[PDB]
Amino acid sequence: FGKRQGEGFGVDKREKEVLARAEKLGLVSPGKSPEEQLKELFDLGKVVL
Amino acid sequence: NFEDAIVISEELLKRDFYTSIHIERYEIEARDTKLGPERITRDIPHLS
Amino acid sequence: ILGLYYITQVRKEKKGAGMAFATPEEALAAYERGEVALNAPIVVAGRETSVGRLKFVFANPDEALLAVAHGLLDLQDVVTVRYLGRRLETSPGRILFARIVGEAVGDEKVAQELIQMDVPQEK
Amino acid sequence: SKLKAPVFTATTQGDHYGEFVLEPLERGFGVTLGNPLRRILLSSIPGTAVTSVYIEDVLHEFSTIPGVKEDVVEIILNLKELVVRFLDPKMASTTLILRAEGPKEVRAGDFTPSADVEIMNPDLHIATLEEGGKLYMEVRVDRGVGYVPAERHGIKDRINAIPVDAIFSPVRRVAFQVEDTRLGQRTDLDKLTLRIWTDGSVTPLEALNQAVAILKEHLNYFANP
Amino acid sequence: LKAPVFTATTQGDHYGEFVLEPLERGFGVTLGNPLRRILLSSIPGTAVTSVYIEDVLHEFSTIPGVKEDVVEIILNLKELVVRFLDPKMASTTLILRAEGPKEVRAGDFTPSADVEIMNPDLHIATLEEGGKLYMEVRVDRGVGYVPAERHGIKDRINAIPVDAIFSPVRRVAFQVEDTRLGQRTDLDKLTLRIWTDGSVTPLEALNQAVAILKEHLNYFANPEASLLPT
Amino acid sequence: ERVVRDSLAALYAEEDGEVVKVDGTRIAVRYEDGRLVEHPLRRYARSNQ
Amino acid sequence: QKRKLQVGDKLANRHGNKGVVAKILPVEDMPHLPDGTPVDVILNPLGV
Question: Hey, what domains does chain D have and what are their CATH numbers?
Answer without folding.
Answer: 4-46+169-222 (3.30.1360.10), 47-168 (2.170.120.12)
